[PDB]
Amino acid sequence: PKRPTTLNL
Amino acid sequence: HHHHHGSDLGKKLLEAARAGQDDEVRILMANGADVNASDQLGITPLHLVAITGHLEIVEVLLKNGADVNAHDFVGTTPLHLAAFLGHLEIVEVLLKYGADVNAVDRDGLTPLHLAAIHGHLEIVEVLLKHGALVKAKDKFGKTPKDLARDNGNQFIYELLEKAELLEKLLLEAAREGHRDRVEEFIKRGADVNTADETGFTPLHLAAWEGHLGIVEVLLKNGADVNANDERGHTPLHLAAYTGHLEIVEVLLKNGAGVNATDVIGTAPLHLAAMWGHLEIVEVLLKHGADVNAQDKFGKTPFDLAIDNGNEDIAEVLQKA
Amino acid sequence: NNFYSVEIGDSTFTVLKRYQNLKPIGSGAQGIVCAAYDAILERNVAIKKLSRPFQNQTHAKRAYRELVLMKCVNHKNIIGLLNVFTPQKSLEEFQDVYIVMELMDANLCQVIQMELDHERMSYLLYQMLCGIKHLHSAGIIHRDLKPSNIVVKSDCTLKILDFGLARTAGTSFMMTPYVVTRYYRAPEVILGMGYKENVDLWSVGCIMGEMVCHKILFPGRDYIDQWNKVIEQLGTPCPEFMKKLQPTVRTYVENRPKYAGYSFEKLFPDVLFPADSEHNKLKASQARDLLSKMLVIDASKRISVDEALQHPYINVWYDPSEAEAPPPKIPDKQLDEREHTIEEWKELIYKEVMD
Numbered sequence A: 001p002k003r004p005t006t007l008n009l
Numbered sequence B: 001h002h003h004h005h006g007s008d009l010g011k012k013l014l015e016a017a018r019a020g021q022d023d024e025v026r027i028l029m030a031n032g033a034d035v036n037a038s039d040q041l042g043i044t045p046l047h048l049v050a051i052t053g054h055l056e057i058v059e060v061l062l063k064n065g066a067d068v069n070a071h072d073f074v075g076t077t078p079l080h081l082a083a084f085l086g087h088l089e090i091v092e093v094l095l096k097y098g099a100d101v102n103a104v105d106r107d108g109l110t111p112l113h114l115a116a117i118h119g120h121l122e123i124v125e126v127l128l129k130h131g132a133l134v135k136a137k138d139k140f141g142k143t144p145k146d147l148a149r150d151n152g153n154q155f156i157y158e159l160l161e162k163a164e165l166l167e168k169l170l171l172e173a174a175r176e177g178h179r180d181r182v183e184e185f186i187k188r189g190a191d192v193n194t195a196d197e198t199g200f201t202p203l204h205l206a207a208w209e210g211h212l213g214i215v216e217v218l219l220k221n222g223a224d225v226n227a228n229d230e231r232g233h234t235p236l237h238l239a240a241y242t243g244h245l246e247i248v249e250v251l252l253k254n255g256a257g258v259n260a261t262d263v264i265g266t267a268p269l270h271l272a273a274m275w276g277h278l279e280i281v282e283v284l285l286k287h288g289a290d291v292n293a294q295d296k297f298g299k300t301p302f303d304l305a306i307d308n309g310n311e312d313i314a315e316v317l318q319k320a
Numbered sequence C: 001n002n003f004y005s006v007e008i009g010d011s012t013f014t015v016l017k018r019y020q021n022l023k024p025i026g027s028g029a030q031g032i033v034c035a036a037y038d039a040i041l042e043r044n045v046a047i048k049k050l051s052r053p054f055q056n057q058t059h060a061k062r063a064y065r066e067l068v069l070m071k072c073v074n075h076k077n078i079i080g081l082l083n084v085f086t087p088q089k090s091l092e093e094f095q096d097v098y099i100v101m102e103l104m105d106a107n108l109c110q111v112i113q114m115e116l117d118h119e120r121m122s123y124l125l126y127q128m129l130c131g132i133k134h135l136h137s138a139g140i141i142h143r144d145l146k147p148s149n150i151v152v153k154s155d156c157t158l159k160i161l162d163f164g165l166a167r168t169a170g171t172s173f174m175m176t177p178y179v180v181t182r183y184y185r186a187p188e189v190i191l192g193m194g195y196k197e198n199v200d201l202w203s204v205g206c207i208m209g210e211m212v213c214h215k216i217l218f219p220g221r222d223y224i225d226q227w228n229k230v231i232e233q234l235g236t237p238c239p240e241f242m243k244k245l246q247p248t249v250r251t252y253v254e255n256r257p258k259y260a261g262y263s264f265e266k267l268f269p270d271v272l273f274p275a276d277s278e279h280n281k282l283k284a285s286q287a288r289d290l291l292s293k294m295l296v297i298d299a300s301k302r303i304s305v306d307e308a309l310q311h312p313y314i315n316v317w318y319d320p321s322e323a324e325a326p327p328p329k330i331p332d333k334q335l336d337e338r339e340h341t342i343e344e345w346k347e348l349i350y351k352e353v354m355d
C-alpha cells in the first residue's frame, strides 16, 4: 500500500 | 514416630503485614503470633511493615521484640528497605530501636548507598548523623558518593563530597601533628576511623609521625587500635618501626594486637628487632610477643636481629 | 538594534527581527514554545527559549547536549534545527538561548485520543521506530519518549522533539503539569537495573497501547507504585528476571503481592482495534502480536528496534533510506561524560550558540 497522506488534528 | 504440628500464625501474620492490614496484624499479635516469624526467604514482619511504611505497627513490632537487624536471603535489613523506599519516619524509628547503620547486603550495599542511589537527601543526613561510613565500598568498589553521581543526585553528591573532604582533613591533621585541628574536626563529626586510598587511618599517621598527644586523642574518641592498611600494618607496627616507646605503651594499653602480622608475616616484634629498638623489644616481650613467629621466609625476630647485626637484641630473643 | 522583544504571557521573548508574530503553541519543562513566521525564509518556524541554562548543572548538561545533537542530527523523524541565537552581546552579559526548529502541527496527545485506522497507526509507529533507530546509531538512548515530546503534522509525518535522558540524567527532568513521566518509565529504570537500547520499545509499547485503549496503560500514583500497576496487568515476572536485581530491590520485588496478569488477548481485545485493513499484515492480531513483544518486563526477552521494524505490522513501510540512514557523527566524544562548573558551562554553551 501507499503511506497515508493526511492526519486530521 | 512423633508427629508435631503447629498453628503457624506467623504465616498469617506475614501475609497480613505484606497486605498492609493493620487490624489483622494487631489481632494476630493479640492471639499469640510471633513477631519474628521467618519466611523461607528470611523475611520477617518488620521487613514487610517497613515496606508498607506503617509507622504505628513498626513500633508495635519493635516494642514486642522484633529483630531490628534481621536480614533475608540476600542480606536485606528493614533499614535497607526503608532507605530504598524513602520512609524517613521508619528510618528514624528503626535507628531508635538499635538498627545497624552500616548493615551490609549480598552485594556490599549499606543503607547509605540506597539513600544515595534513590535521592533521599534527608535520609542521607539521618544515616550520616547516626554514624554511617561515608566511604563505604560495595561489591564493585563504589562509594555512596559514586552512586549518587551515577544516578544524578547532585545535591546528595555535593553533601557526601564535603563529608569526604572533612575526613580528608582529619587524616592530614593527624599526620602533620596539629592537635587543635584534630580535635576540631572530631567535633564537626569527622569519622575518627576514616581510611585513605591505601588504608591508613588517622591513628596510623599519628603513630608513624610520633604524635603521641594525637594518638591519645584519637584513642579517647574511639579509634580502631588494630585497624589494617592494605599491606596489613596496624598502628602498633608503625610505632614499633619508629621506636617511639611512649606510643607503643599507649597502644598496648588500649588493646593493641602485639602479635599481628602483615601479608609477609611481619609482626611488631620483627620490626623492632629489624631496626634495633631494644627498648621496644623488651616491652613487646613484656606484653606477650611471640618469639618463634616466622614470616613468609621462615625468619624469626631473632633471625632478623642476626641479619641486621643487632647483637644485643638477638641475645634477649635467644633467652626467650 | 537588530533585536526586538515581545511579551508572550509572562515570558519575554527577545528574538531576531526576522521572526514576526510570535504565538504560544505549548508549555514545557524548559519554558514556553512559540510559533513564528521567519520573514527571511518565508516559512513558519518554532522558537523555544532557555533561560539561564548554565545556572542549573543538570539543565546546563541537557542544554549543551541538545545543542550539539540538534546540529549534527539531520533525519526525517527527528525535529530539525533552523537557527540558534542569543540577544546578549558578550560572554559576561550572556543569559538566554533561543532554538529555532521546524514547526509541527501538534503533539501525540491529539493523535492518541482520536480514532485511527491500522494504516495510520502502523505508519506512525514506523516513523517512531525510524527515529529511535537513528538515535541509537549515534549512541543516544532516549529513555524519555512520551506523547508530549513527539509531534505530528497534518500530512501524517512524525518527529521526536528532544533526546531524552542521559545515563547520569536520572529518572526525570524539570517539572511540567502537562506530562507524567512515570507512566512511560521502563521496568529496568524503575527497579534500578541497567538499561539497554531496547528500553525505548517499552515507551513505544505504552504509546501504542494508548492508541488502542485510549487511556493510560500503567498509571502509577508514585514512583515505586508504577511497578505495582505494571505487574497488576502483565503479571509478576519470572524468577529468571528477579535474579538480576540488586539485593534491596529484589527483596522488595520478591515480597510484592503475586499477580498472574492477563493475556494480551484479554488486555487488547479485537474490539479495541479498528477494522482489519485490506492489507494482509494490518490485522488486529498483528498489532496485538507487536504489543506482546514490546510490553515485556524482562528486557532480555524484549525485541529490539531492528526486530520491530521487521515485524509484519511495521515492515509494510520499510524504506532503507529512513531506517538504515547513515549514522550522525557527534563531534564531542565526551558529550555526556564531561563535568564543569557553572561558569565553565556558561562559556561552553555560549560557544555553541555563536558558532
Ligand SMILES: Nc1ncnc2c1ncn2[C@@H]1O[C@H](CO)[C@@H](O)[C@H]1O
Residues within 6 Å of the ligand: C025, C026, C027, C028, C033, C046, C079, C101, C102, C103, C104, C105, C106, C107, C147, C148, C149, C150, C151, C161
Ligand atoms: N517544533 C514544535 N512544533 C510544534 N509543537 C511544539 C514544538 N515544540 C514544542 N511543541 C509543543 O510544546 C510541547 C512541549 O514543548 C509539545 O507537546 C507541543 O505541543
